[PDB]
Amino acid sequence: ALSAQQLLNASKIDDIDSMMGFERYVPPQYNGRFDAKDIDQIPGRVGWLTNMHATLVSQEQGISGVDFYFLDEEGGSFKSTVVYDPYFFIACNDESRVNDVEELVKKYLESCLKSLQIIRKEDLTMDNHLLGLQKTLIKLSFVNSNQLFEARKLLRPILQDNANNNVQRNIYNVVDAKHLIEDIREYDVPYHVRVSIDKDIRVGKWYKVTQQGFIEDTRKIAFADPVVMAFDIETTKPPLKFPDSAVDQIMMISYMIDGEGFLITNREIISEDIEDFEYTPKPEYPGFFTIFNENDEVALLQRFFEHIRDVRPTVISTFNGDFFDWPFIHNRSKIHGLDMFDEIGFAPDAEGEYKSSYCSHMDCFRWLKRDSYLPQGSQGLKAVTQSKLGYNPIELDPELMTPYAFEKPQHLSEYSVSDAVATYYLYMKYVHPFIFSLCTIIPLNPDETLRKGTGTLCEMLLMVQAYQHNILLPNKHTDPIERFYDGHLLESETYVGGHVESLEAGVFRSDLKNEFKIDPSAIDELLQELPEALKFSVEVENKSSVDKVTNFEEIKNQITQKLLELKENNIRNELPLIYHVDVASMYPNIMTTNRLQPDSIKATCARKLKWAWRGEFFPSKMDEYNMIKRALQNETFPNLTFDELSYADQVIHIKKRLTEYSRKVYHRVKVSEIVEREAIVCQRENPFYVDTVKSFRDRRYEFKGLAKTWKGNLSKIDPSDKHARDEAKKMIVLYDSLQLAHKVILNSFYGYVMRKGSRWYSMEMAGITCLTGATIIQMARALVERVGRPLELDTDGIWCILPKSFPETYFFTLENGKKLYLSYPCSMLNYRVHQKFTNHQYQELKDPLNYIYETHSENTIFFEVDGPYKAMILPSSKEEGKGIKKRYAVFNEDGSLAELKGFELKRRGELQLIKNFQSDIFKVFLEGDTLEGCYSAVASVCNRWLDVLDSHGLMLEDEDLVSLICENRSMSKTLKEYEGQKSTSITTARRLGDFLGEDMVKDKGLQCKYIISSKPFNAPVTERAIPVAIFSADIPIKRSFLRRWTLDPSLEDLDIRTIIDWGYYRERLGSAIQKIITIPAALQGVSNPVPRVEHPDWLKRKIAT
DNA sequence: TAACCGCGTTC
DNA sequence: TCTTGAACGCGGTTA
Ligand SMILES: Nc1ncnc2c1ncn2[C@H]1C[C@H](O)[C@@H](COP(=O)(O)OP(=O)(O)OP(=O)(O)O)O1
Ligand SMILES: [Ca+2]
Ligand SMILES: [Ca+2]
């Protein structure tokens, strides 16, 4: 049956792979000893593994196996196949009768079963597993994965009535072979992952394919250089509209192959033959493009296809190729009578992405979305090239794409080529090293390593460890459709996450003094701890000993005297040191310190830790719940009766009906409560999980430290050596990229235990990680409060100021002449966290043969310092007593922007006016020589921006006004999925649809460019919202919609200037100028620097005193 | 006024 | 199907 298609597909894939240079290599037969240490002697072919896919194979029903795609040492390529029987396990609730269920499944599954076997694995949910006791399991093996699925289909009936009550007719009678099946296990492992794990094969490693299997050649390590292609397609476009692969044609396709550029053009659209040209944005990105002017598109497609066949690419990179370019070329190939999969072996898959068997499709957009660590407002190719490649790509407005086909083809070709350059070199210097290296530890191919969620990446890593330690995988987690608490249905339940505080606002600068009030008892405490904390820094922070340090006492006495000056003069007006302290990999290091794992949470090996639980429940109670349901049982349903509907479909009707009843009587739709819960953490459980976290943390620390090394080397580089300065700066962005790309995967080991379908779910374990972190950040803040003035706090980071005279940086001197770095403000914190948050109960197996553990003290929680900074600027809220958190600006000593966070300037969309405003104002806080002077200097910029708005934009030209006044906002789903909701995006989506057709809203992720109107008057802002595109429409079209939209049937004036509700914009900017300058200025004792923006009444009253 | 939502950041 | 988490700002509706 269904095998038919699979066997057919393989023959196809086999022929296309053969066409592209991968043909099955069957290694010679060897009757000599199979050790890895004789690899040179064993006959076989050595190659670099670049790809792997599951296949069926008819012998030399189909047989399951994995094709492996190799690049050989001699410049060629080949594939080799590994067969491996797929398998899962049957768990038994009576291990004395495994025999009987064994003989039962043997008969019952005769149709699909191949072989059967009794095994044993470690089960962390079984008592006495730490003493060597193991769970007995039946290993069912199959010829192919269809047979495996078939057995699952036959077992679940048994699995599902065993859960249901058995019906015994002889009521007067007080166990069957089928009821002994408790569960099946490891039944949902992707086959190629299973082969990849059980066989320890990884893409990116070198092997020698031999008769007895694959032998890793540890003597190579350096990756082979594959043939890499990257392409961009530019197409024709209806004015003010989206390209349609049904109507529109490809104008031109630009690509690059191992550094050499090319360019196809359809002369029917392009209207001019083009000639070889060069686009080399920077020396390190050479771009010589040869051009292939073609007559009809059909020839453009054939020529693109032809090349590919000649080049034999193993990697094809694009930029959003999965959802536009690849599909587009498909529809056009179909329309023009070409089958692309016969032409180049590419075709869409189940999720609609485009893959091939031999060549990986490397969509840079997927990397950027997951691993670039950039905001989504910075993930467009223009901005990515600036951040990561250090140059400005060529910018051409999409509306002018289609006409510039004729007016200036050569210009449009330059832009086409600019997209290709940026895509190839973005892939080659960021994606390709990261993904292929990742494959050497993660059992996926490049295509999957690029696209899988970071949680799944964590899961893959964890499954390797669990298998290699012979640990049985738990089945995927299943959230209950209904959960309750004190008789109330739970809308949602979670834990209290990170702790965040805004404590101050305003301007803080290295040349502008502040008041400090130092707690004298704080100085006493530090001095009591100074000797042991200094030893701590040397012994633990720098892994040395007090014996080889020679200036210990001077540094001590130096520190001691500065501290003593601060104890007497506790009231001081000094220049500040703007510092930031942040725990390195906080949550991971908290899990490793406390030996935290989902499997360590139990109900002395026991380390009791607290977390905070938070639930959201209906104030309704069981009585109300029981009633509403019966009501619902009586309605007829669209399709039916309520009981007829799926349990899920039932409860979702219930939830919508509960929200209404509770509001009527309870009057509150939901109730929030925080319960503190204590969980047991067994300090002796098999540590395979946390060890995986430990390993991946250390993997990241590798790159974070190299970033820090080269950030130091650039300081040593002399200003004149531009090449050196440039390379180091290039190394810094390289390692910052690599270390950030690991950060998300790393922290996903913490997320994973709350993820849906998690094989290792524990709400407790995540809760305890968060609450511990809240305790550590707050004890740190308590001390800096007593000795300085903290500014913002966020989970693990503290921005604070300190008196210039607070002990700062000191350098120990060693017997070796070497020096040890010491930041006193850092090590004073690090000593107290290590004295109050150390796990003295950490246990590990010392002797596995007799199960002897040693108990022990662990702690890897360290603050790290960056600073001192030149300026920090915190906004304040418009509301009394409140602050803005997760938003601020920081500046380095040289005047460069250190960090900008949270602000609209960084986010995607937002109103461009506030973007450009923020872009201009922040840097201005560096001027003036007094705080009052500084606010003045920024006030000048504010009034200038206030001027353009009070002038009703008569001040700057039209094409420049549309940008400043537009607000772009993306829309997660299609508008059809938003009804019952009102927003400026939702309106702009309808009006785009009405005027430009329903096609506009068919695809989600729409980006709604809108200005809001003055009319209708007193109408809600959501309703007075106009797509920008209308103002580029023909005058009759504009008038009809605008008058309709403004609700004035007689409006003749059709100028953007008249319609704009400049009032909205002034309020918006004012709130901006208010929170960033005016209100903050007051909290710093400065009378309103922008008097045209009025204060709030509460501030006026406190200003009034 | 306060609760609640979608989006997109900071952790 | 496949799928890391919680805390937060902001403009906007809604009770
Ligand atoms: N994307 C994320 N997913 C899950 N947890 C996260 C994420 N980002 C941050 N966290 C959590 C876990 C981190 O330990 C904690 C502190 O945030 P942050 O300081 O940005 O990261 P970090 O402390 O792990 O790395 P770093 O060494 O760069 O400080 O916040
Ligand atoms: Ca393009
Ligand atoms: Ca951190």
DSSP string, A501-553: EE---EEEETTS-EEEE--HHHHHHHHHHHHHHHHHIIIIISS--TTTBSSHH
- A435 and A462 both lie in a single domain: no
Tokens at A865, concatenated: 């310092």
What does the alpha-carbon distance between residue A710 and residue A1020 come to, in Å, rounded to a whole number? 54
Tell me which H or E stretch contains A286.
Answer: none
Give the list of residues 6+ apart from residue A1005 with CB closer than 8 angstroms, or none: A970, A971, A972
**From the CB of residue A712, how many other CB atoms can be counted at a distance below 10 Å?**
11
Q: Residues A301, A235: contact at Cβ < 8 Å?
A: no
Point out the nucleotide closest to A1021 (alpha carbon to C1′): C12
Among A587, A699, A833, A860, residue to substitute to test ligand 1 (most atoms within 8 Å of Cβ)? A587
In the chain, the amino acid numbered A266 is N
Q: Residues A581, A544: contact at Cβ < 8 Å?
A: no
What does the alpha-carbon distance between residue A313 and residue A311 come to, in Å, rounded to a whole number? 6
What secondary structure does DSSP assign to A379-421, as a single string? -SHHHHIIIII-S------HHHHTTHHHH-HHHHHHHHHHHHH
DSSP A24: B
Of A877, A904, A931, the residue that ends a domain is A904
What does the alpha-carbon distance between residue A56 and residue A346 come to, in Å, rounded to a whole number? 19
Nucleotides of C under 7 A from a protein CB: 1-15
Q: Residues A66, A84: contact at Cβ < 8 Å?
A: yes
Question: SS3 for A132-178, per residue?
Answer: CCCEEEEEEECCCHHHHHHHHHHHHHHHHHHHCCCCCCCCCCCCCHH
Q: How was this structure determined?
A: X-ray
Give the list of residues 6+ apart from residue A946 with CB closer than 8 angstroms, or none: A1066, A1069, A1070, A1073, A1090, A1092, A1093
What does the alpha-carbon distance between residue A572 and residue A566 come to, in Å, rounded to a whole number? 9
CB hemisphere CA count around A947 (13 angstroms): 8
- A742 CA → ligand 2 middle, Å: 29
DSSP A210: E
What does the alpha-carbon distance between residue A610 and residue A674 come to, in Å, rounded to a whole number? 13
Long-range contacts of A1030-1039, Cβ-Cβ distance < 8 Å, separation of 24 or more? A1030/A991, A1030/A995, A1031/A962, A1031/A1056, A1032/A239, A1032/A240, A1032/A399, A1033/A240, A1033/A995, A1037/A995
- A308 and A422 both lie in a single domain: yes
β-bridge partners, A797: A582, A794
Residue A71's closest CA among A190, A258, A209?
A209
Q: Residues A709, A701: contact at Cβ < 8 Å?
A: no
Of A868, A886, A904, the residue that ends a domain is A904
Give the list of residues 6+ apart from residue A876 with CB closer than 8 angstroms, or none: A505, A506, A883, A884, A1075, A1079, A1080, A1083
Point out the nucleotide closest to A672 (alpha carbon to C1′): B3
What size, in residues, is chain A? 1105
Give the list of residues 6+ apart from residue A408 with CB closer than 8 angstroms, or none: none
Ligand number nearest to the C-alpha of A707 = 1
Burial (0-12, 13-18, 19+ Cβ within 10 Å), A786: middle
Q: Residues A836, A470: contact at Cβ < 8 Å?
A: no
Q: Residues A565, A572: contact at Cβ < 8 Å?
A: no
Residue A80's closest CA among A40, A43, A53, A42?
A53
Point out the nucleotide closest to A497 (alpha carbon to C1′): C6
Q: Residues A956, A968: contact at Cβ < 8 Å?
A: no
SS3 content of chain A, % helix, strand, coil (to 5): 45, 25, 35
Residue A549's closest CA among A535, A566, A533, A563?
A535
Among A795, A798, A833, residue to substitute to test ligand 1 (most atoms within 8 Å of Cβ)? A795
Q: In what order do the strands lie in the sheet with A500-502?
A: A500-502, A789-794, A797-803, A576-583, A863-869
- A607 CA → ligand 1 middle, Å: 25
Q: Is the CB of residue A747 below 6 angstroms from any atom belonging to ligand 1? A: yes
**From the CB of residue A817, how many other CB atoms can be counted at a distance below 10 Å?**
7
C-alpha A223: how far from chain center: 27
What secondary structure does DSSP assign to A66-125, as a single string? EEEEEEETTS-EEEEEEE---EEEEEES-TT-HHHHHHHHHHHTTTT--EEEEEEEB-TT
What does the alpha-carbon distance between residue A433 and residue A435 come to, in Å, rounded to a whole number? 6
Q: Specify which residue's alpha carbon is closest to the C1' of nucleotide B11.
A: A795
Q: Which numbered atom of ligand 1 lies nearest the CA of A744?
A: 1
Tell me which H or E stretch contains A366.
Answer: helix A364-370
Of A722, A757, A792, the residue that ends a domain is A757
What is the SS3 assignment for A231? strand
Q: Is the CB of residue A584 below 6 angstroms from any atom belonging to ligand 1? A: yes
- A955 and A854 both lie in a single domain: no
Any idea of the CA torsion for A663, A665, A668, A669, to the nearest 10 degrees? -40
Biggest alpha carbon–alpha carbon distance for chain A: 99
Burial (0-12, 13-18, 19+ Cβ within 10 Å), A595: buried
Q: Is the CB of residue A796 below 6 angstroms from any atom belonging to ligand 1? A: yes
- A326 and A430 both lie in a single domain: yes
Q: Which numbered atom of ligand 1 lies nearest the CA of A586?
A: 14
What does the alpha-carbon distance between residue A314 and residue A72 come to, in Å, rounded to a whole number? 13
What does the alpha-carbon distance between residue A184 and residue A204 come to, in Å, rounded to a whole number? 34
What does the alpha-carbon distance between residue A447 and residue A354 come to, in Å, rounded to a whole number? 10
What does the alpha-carbon distance between residue A1048 and residue A1027 come to, in Å, rounded to a whole number? 17
Q: Which numbered atom of ligand 1 lies nearest the CA of A587?
A: 14
Query: Domain span at residue A3?
Result: 1-85+190-223
- A195 and A291 both lie in a single domain: no
What does the alpha-carbon distance between residue A1 and residue A21 come to, in Å, rounded to a whole number? 31
Q: Residues A418, A397: contact at Cβ < 8 Å?
A: no
Q: Which numbered atom of ligand 1 lies nearest the CA of A797?
A: 19
What interhelical angle do A824-836 and A520-536 show, nearest 10? 80
Q: Is the CB of residue A454 below 6 angstroms from any atom belonging to ligand 1? A: no
What does the alpha-carbon distance between residue A709 and residue A716 come to, in Å, rounded to a whole number? 11
Measured in degrees and rounded to the nearest 5, phi and psi for residue A77 equal: -155, 160
- A232 CA → ligand 2 middle, Å: 5
- A713 and A575 both lie in a single domain: no
Point out the nucleotide closest to A580 (alpha carbon to C1′): B11
Q: Is the CB of residue A866 below 6 angstroms from any atom belonging to ligand 1? A: no
What interhelical angle do A984-996 and A1035-1046 show, nearest 10? 140
Phi-psi domain of A795 (left: phi exceeds 0; alpha: psi -120 through 50; beta: other): left
- A537 and A678 both lie in a single domain: yes
What is the SS3 assignment for A500? strand
Please report, rounded to whole angstroms, the spatial distance between the CA atom of protein residue A916 and the C1' atom of nucleotide B4.
31
Which residues does nucleic strand B approach, with CB less than 7 A? A 375-378, 498, 668-670, 792, 794-797, 886-887, 900-902, 906-909, 969-973, 981, 983, 985
Q: Is the CB of residue A490 below 6 angstroms from any atom belonging to ligand 1? A: no
Domains contained in chain A, number: 6
**From the CB of residue A186, how many other CB atoms can be counted at a distance below 10 Å?**
20
Please report, rounded to whole angstroms, the spatial distance between the CA atom of protein residue A239 and the C1' atom of nucleotide C12.
32
Measured in degrees and rounded to the nearest 5, phi and psi for residue A114 equal: -100, -55
- A341 and A421 both lie in a single domain: yes
DSSP A473: P
β-bridge partners, A87: A141
What does the alpha-carbon distance between residue A491 and residue A487 come to, in Å, rounded to a whole number? 13
Ligand number nearest to the C-alpha of A231 = 2
Matching residue, tokens 């819960």: A677
Tokens at A978, concatenated: 């938003």
| Break sites following residues in chain A (C–N > 2.5 A) | 60, 174, 603, 639
β-bridge partners, A1006: A971
Q: Residues A228, A427: contact at Cβ < 8 Å?
A: yes
What does the alpha-carbon distance between residue A636 and residue A263 come to, in Å, rounded to a whole number? 62
CA distances to A695, A783, A786 from A832, rounded to whole Å, are 26, 10, 15
Q: Whose CA is nearest to atom 4 of ligand 1?
A: A747
Q: Residues A472, A186: contact at Cβ < 8 Å?
A: yes
Q: Which residues of A30-68 are buried (b: 16+ CB within 10 A; e: fewer)?
A: eeeeeeeeebeebebbbbbbbbbbbbbbeeeebbbbbbb
Please report, rounded to whole angstroms, the spatial distance between the CA atom of protein residue A605 and the C1' atom of nucleotide C2.
37
Q: Which numbered atom of ligand 1 lies nearest the CA of A582?
A: 29
β-bridge partners, A234: A252
Q: Is the CB of residue A589 below 6 angstroms from any atom belonging to ligand 1? A: no
- A716 and A619 both lie in a single domain: no
Ligand number nearest to the C-alpha of A394 = 2
In the chain, the amino acid numbered A997 is G
Q: Whose CA is nearest to atom 10 of ligand 1?
A: A747
Q: Residues A6, A56: contact at Cβ < 8 Å?
A: yes
Please report, rounded to whole angstroms, the spatial distance between the CA atom of protein residue A360 and the C1' atom of nucleotide C2.
20
What is the SS3 assignment for A6? helix
What does the alpha-carbon distance between residue A176 and residue A162 come to, in Å, rounded to a whole number? 10
Strands A315-318 and A360-363: parallel
Q: Which numbered atom of ligand 1 lies nearest the CA of A589?
A: 14
- A388 and A252 both lie in a single domain: yes
Q: Residues A943, A951: contact at Cβ < 8 Å?
A: no
Tokens at A393, concatenated: 């790509």
What does the alpha-carbon distance between residue A725 and residue A231 come to, in Å, rounded to a whole number? 32
Q: Specify which residue's alpha carbon is closest to the C1' of nucleotide C5.
A: A751
What does the alpha-carbon distance between residue A253 and residue A235 come to, in Å, rounded to a whole number? 9
Q: Residues A123, A212: contact at Cβ < 8 Å?
A: no
In the chain, the amino acid numbered A575 is L
Point out the nucleotide closest to A1064 (alpha carbon to C1′): C11
CA distances to A88, A125, A663, A690, A761 from A469, rounded to whole Å, are 17, 15, 53, 14, 20
What does the alpha-carbon distance between residue A591 and residue A753 come to, in Å, rounded to a whole number? 12
- A556 and A504 both lie in a single domain: yes
Q: Is the CB of residue A586 below 6 angstroms from any atom belonging to ligand 1? A: yes
- A91 and A35 both lie in a single domain: no
Measured in degrees and rounded to the nearest 5, phi and psi for residue A542 equal: -115, 10
Residue A365's closest CA among A381, A353, A382, A386?
A381
